[PDB]
Amino acid sequence: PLSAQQLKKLEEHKYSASGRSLVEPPMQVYWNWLVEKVPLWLAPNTITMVGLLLNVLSTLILVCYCPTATEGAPFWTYLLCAIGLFVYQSLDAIDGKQARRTNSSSPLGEMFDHGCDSISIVFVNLGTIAAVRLGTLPGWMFYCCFVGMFMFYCAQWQTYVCGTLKFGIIDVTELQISVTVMFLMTAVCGPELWDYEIPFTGLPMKTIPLLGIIGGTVYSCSNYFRVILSGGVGKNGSTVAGTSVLSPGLHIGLVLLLALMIYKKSTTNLFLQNPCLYTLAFGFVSAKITIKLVIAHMTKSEISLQDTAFIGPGLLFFNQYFNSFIDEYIVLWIAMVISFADLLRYCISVCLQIATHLRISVFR
Amino acid sequence: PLSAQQLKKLEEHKYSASGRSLVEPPMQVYWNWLVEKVPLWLAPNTITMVGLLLNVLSTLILVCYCPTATEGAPFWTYLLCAIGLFVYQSLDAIDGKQARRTNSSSPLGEMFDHGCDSISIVFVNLGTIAAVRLGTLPGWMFYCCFVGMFMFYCAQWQTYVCGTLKFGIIDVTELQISVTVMFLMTAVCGPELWDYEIPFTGLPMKTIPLLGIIGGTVYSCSNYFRVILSGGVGKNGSTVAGTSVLSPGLHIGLVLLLALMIYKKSTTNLFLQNPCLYTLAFGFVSAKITIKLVIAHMTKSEISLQDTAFIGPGLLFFNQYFNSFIDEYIVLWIAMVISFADLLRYCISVCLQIATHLRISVFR
Ligand SMILES: C[N+](C)(C)CCOP(=O)([O-])OP(=O)(O)OC[C@H]1O[C@@H](n2ccc(N)nc2=O)[C@H](O)[C@@H]1O
Ligand SMILES: C[N+](C)(C)CCOP(=O)([O-])OP(=O)(O)OC[C@H]1O[C@@H](n2ccc(N)nc2=O)[C@H](O)[C@@H]1O
Ligand SMILES: [Mg+2]
Ligand SMILES: [Mg+2]
Ligand SMILES: [Mg+2]
Ligand SMILES: [Mg+2]
Known about the structure:
- The structure is a homodimer.
- Chain A is mainly α.
- The first copy, chain A, has a single domain (4-358), classed as CDP-alcohol phosphotransferase transmembrane (TM) domain (Four Helix Bundle (Hemerythrin (Met), subunit A)), CATH 1.20.120.
- Chain A has 13 helices and two strands, in the order αβαααααβααααααα.
- Chain A has helices at residues 4-10, 24-35, 44-65, 75-100, 107-132, 142-160, 172-189, 207-229, 248-264, 270-273, 275-298, 311-321, 330-358; strands spanning 17-19, 165-167.
- Chain A has a two-stranded parallel ribbon.
- The two termini of chain A are 23 Å apart.
- The A-B interface holds A 265, 320-322 and B 265, 320-322.
- One magnesium ion is lined by residues 92, 96, 113 of chain B.
- Chains A, B: InterPro entries: CDP-OH_P_trans (IPR000462), CDP-OH_PTrfase_TM_dom (IPR043130), CDP_ALCOHOL_P_TRANSF_CS (IPR048254), CHOPT (IPR014472).
- Chains A, B: The active site is at 114 (proton acceptor).
- Chains A, B: Belongs to the CDP-alcohol phosphatidyltransferase class-I family.
- Chains A, B: The chain crosses the membrane at residues 44-64, 75-99, 107-131, 142-160, 172-188, 204-229, 247-262, 275-297, 311-320, 328-357.
């Protein structure tokens, strides 16, 4: 998976990040207090795995009770989703703090953190689409899922072209707090709160979240793109690895363009009746494409625009070219299974190789 | 176009070939006699350019008088085609002999010879399809053109995996003699000779050429493929450049598969009403893909499966994916023009670079 030179350059890696948000200091104190009361023999990898597992399980339950994102869900699922998201955020902060101390820091923890963040953000966006019932507005339904995907991959892309993580003021913490309070409010008042139209303008309640999302996206995107263009750490404004600045842009453009092209020529409404499966398949694809860039900027190597993850989208595209011999509902499942298996294989292989080199006993 | 290392390895190149055919010795004596009476100040590049120009012009006239390959042509075009083919063969033999003497040998002459052979074989196959009127049998119409293309590219592919040219007994000389005598007979007796059905079996006259073609193809293919597998000159059975043995096979498989895929999903009979344009466009594409391998095995470098020549086939494929917004008769012309321009640009650039390095005054 990783060449000898890349694996050699993996060592002597210094984690560095600068930034702070509005709600950080109080929650920073809270996380410090909670981590003050954690056993010293527990490994951070177990903590992040548990957090990811809880978040994914709760989101999976909510998605299974609400296919197409237009039905309603009981108190059970919403409470479970809110608890899972809060636990995920808490465990992320706590295992970060516990890994910085007790001299357990390693390059593998960063890879686990970023992969878990990718999967968790995909599932959280799916859950927040399912809870609001954003199926009565079919126009604003591709945008939310794939802008969450695009925003996270652009955060990674900003990281690749620079050397330090830069934190904004509308970063992940506020988004997670807003989603948690939204889930709690929807649970306590019922799923029909978003059908309680605002006294004026004839616009429903759901415009209050969506607009904010768009605004946040704009702000976030702005910052990232500036660091892409004005900033450069290599011999010039070029990439830290010496390559071009806009290479992974081709990766994400290809992924999103293929998604849009398959969306627009379904002839059987592939997306509006199977949204969760579609978003999950392309989320696994983009998760692999984002984990590749993580290893790319941890090391100093160069990425290619050819991966064994376009098998799913490739099958969909080549089953759309030929008019219709296989119906477009089994091919989606095959693509999702293939993408999930490929992602799991890649992650396991990389983890095993890094463990073998660094002799760190990944779970210990 | 060519890197410094490749251009350095271009020198110290020794042309070597072994083989002989049945009709060679008499025609060998004839060519020796004719070259005995040629001026000593004339360059071989001019001779091969003149031969290629005459062959292409005569074939173009014949093709223009017979689109779709089902009409008839007068005495004029058939006589001109026979004379042009005979002159092309004579000039090839003569300029080869004249380049071996007068110490004018250079690596550029080989590239000119192979490019001219590619273009000439494409045009000769088009002419022999047009003359026989092989349009009343639409099944056996893709096969002939693309098997000529495939056979020449496989001869080059056999050359790449070895070090010396191997000549068979049913090689190009007999094919050209057969085509010349066929053109002469069709001229003298009229185009309707192939509608003079053989006293038995109810099969028309055209089965006499076609069957032979198939047989010849089989024999030729056999030899080439054996040299591909049993023979190896590198550290192992591997390529002389050290790469895999079956890499250009992907190139030709991609070209022919794309041609077949565009053929089979036309929905407007793109091929059976515009055969000459179709074959010419894909002939230019394969001519560029075959000239690349010529430089590849003259040097010791490695080829890629990514060229700026799939623009035409790419436009056709992506205009077939979207149902139909641009009609499928202008896109073919655009693809043909783009392919021809790209081939001309590549050839001119390579010729100019080699002339600049070797200071040989290409035409002198
Ligand atoms: C901004 N916050 C603090 C609210 C949350 C995001 O912060 P973060 O997760 O990027 O930072 P962190 O505190 O987790 O990072 C501590 C470092 O510990 C390492 N790490 C992470 C996870 C893990 N299981 N083992 C580790 O050793 C990583 O290199 C990580 O960079
Ligand atoms: C088998 N024959 C003899 C019937 C025809 C095919 O033979 P061929 O064209 O491969 O051989 P040839 O006699 O042309 O080759 C002589 C050599 O002269 C060189 N050559 C060719 C053409 C040219 N304009 N200038 C040259 O210097 C090439 O390296 C070529 O290999
Ligand atoms: Mg963390
Ligand atoms: Mg995390
Ligand atoms: Mg010659
Ligand atoms: Mg020749």
